[PDB]
């Protein structure tokens, strides 16, 4: 029974910023569920493929693992057909969305005194999003009528920002580890099972 | 032991751009928050930015406008592209590392490796 | 942004001897100041991490001390080959800042 590695994807030190979120591929393994539903420790839980307890049942051929930091305030917006800063700009999920998403609050590692500065936001964007897209381009973001010419100014603006997680921050603004899992079923021998 | 050599042009022209590339040998990116930092002659280091292993960069606001970071994984190196090069950049460039232990920012840059000159002139 | 200061300029003494840098802050940075070492036409190396503690492999001679917006990085038997710029450095925020040296002769 060589087991799945979500080890390392839920319990790794560092999870990278939303608009750059982590995709990494599990296929070949058995994968255990249960202990992920059954861990209690999760703040939120949510799926939209079948339910959590049937799908130790299920068995898929792929499982991309996608993984950020985000605040409390916009874990809502990570659902199938949502719309919002992140479901445009950072990171939204296809309606047809076959899988779900863990988060957990984090407060006590992802914030600083001084408030964290690595976690970045795309703030704006000139296009919305296809699903499953990922963008890290940076060119600066002209809102106004002049090119910006590859320099900031009036009406110019950098398109990242960065939350200022502080430890004594309300709940609604309290960094949150979310990961989601896309499980596909393509036309291929089904590895990821129960 | 993390092995690094820099590896990037000896000279440019001024307006155009410059592209250095960080080679590291007997390391793991797979974690680790990797910056570049510059020192003119006779001057002090200032930093430029880091980048992680994903994606996820983070620039100096002062440069920011000008710099691009890339990370590729599989050949396990650098690319610092910085544009609008101008007279101010005849400098040395360094490509640092995190030391590891952190939960969610960096920390002190460890791993410096022997930095390469830049000379920007016509 | 944030400014460092180190106090000592420049500064000779002998063998043996204990030297000691201050680099102060330009606002509060609770423990997050790095100790570099700088020999000449070489990269510099990392001394002292988190202001207090001693990086793994570097001899026990040096030392370091402070809190708030004041640190202190103390040589307490200087050697021959202690001959370096030293260089004091945050990063509690962006942009990461390096003091402008301390040349010791």
């Known amino acids: 029974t060589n087991l799945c590695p979500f080890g390392e994807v839920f319990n790794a030190t560092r999870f990278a910023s939303v608009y750059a979120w982590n995709r990494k591929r599990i296929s070949n393994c058995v994968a255990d569920y249960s202990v992920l539903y059954n861990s209690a420790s999760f703040s939120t839980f949510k799926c939209y493929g079948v339910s959590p307890t049937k799908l130790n049942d299920l068995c898929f051929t792929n499982v991309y693992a996608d993984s950020f930091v985000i605040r409390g305030d916009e874990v809502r917006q990570i659902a199938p057909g949502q719309t919002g800063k992140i479901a445009d700009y950072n990171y939204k999920l296809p309606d047809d969305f076959t899988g779900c998403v863990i988060a957990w609050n984090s407060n006590n590692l992802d914030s600083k005194v001084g408030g964290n500065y690595n976690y970045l936001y795309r703030l704006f964007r000139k296009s919305n999003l296809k699903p499953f897209e990922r963008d890290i381009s940076t060119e600066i973001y002209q809102a106004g009528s002049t090119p910006c010419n590859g320099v900031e100014g009036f009406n110019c603006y950098f398109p990242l920002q960065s939350y200022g997680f502080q430890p004594t921050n309300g709940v609604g603004y309290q960094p949150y580890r979310v990961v989601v899992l896309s499980f596909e079923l393509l036309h291929a021998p089904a590895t990821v099972c129960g | 032991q993390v092995q690094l050599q820099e590896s990037g042009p000896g000279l440019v022209k001024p307006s155009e751009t410059l592209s250095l590339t960080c080679t590291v040998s007997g390391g793991s990116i797979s974690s680790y928050y990797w910056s570049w930092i510059r020192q003119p002659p006779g001057k002090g280091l200032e930093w430029i930015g880091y980048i992680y292993y994903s994606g996820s960069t983070n620039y100096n606001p002062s440069l920011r406008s000008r710099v691009t970071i890339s990370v590729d994984t599989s050949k396990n190196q650098f690319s610092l592209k910085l544009s609008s090069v101008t007279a101010a950049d005849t400098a040395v460039y360094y490509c640092?590392?995190?030391?590891?232990?952190?939960?969610?920012?960096?920390?002190?840059?460890?791993?410096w490796g022997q930095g390469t000159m830049v000379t920007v002139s016509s | 942004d944030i400014q460092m200061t180190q106090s000592p300029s420049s500064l000779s003494a002998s063998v043996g001897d204990r030297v000691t840098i201050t680099c102060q802050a330009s606002?509060?940075?609770?423990?997050?100041l790095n100790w570099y070492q700088q020999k000449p036409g070489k990269a510099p190396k990392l001394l002292i991490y988190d202001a207090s503690n001693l990086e793994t492999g570097v001899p026990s001679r040096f030392s370091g001390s402070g809190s708030g917006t004041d640190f202190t990085f103390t040589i307490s038997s200087l050697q021959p080959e202690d001959i370096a710029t030293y260089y004091c450095?945050?990063?509690?925020?962006?942009?990461?800042?390096f003091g402008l040296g301390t040349k010791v002769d």
């Open positions: 450095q945050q990063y509690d925020n962006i942009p990461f800042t």
């Open positions: 606002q509060d940075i609770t423990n997050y």
């Open positions: 640092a590392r995190d030391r590891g232990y952190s939960s969610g920012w960096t920390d002190g840059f460890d791993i």
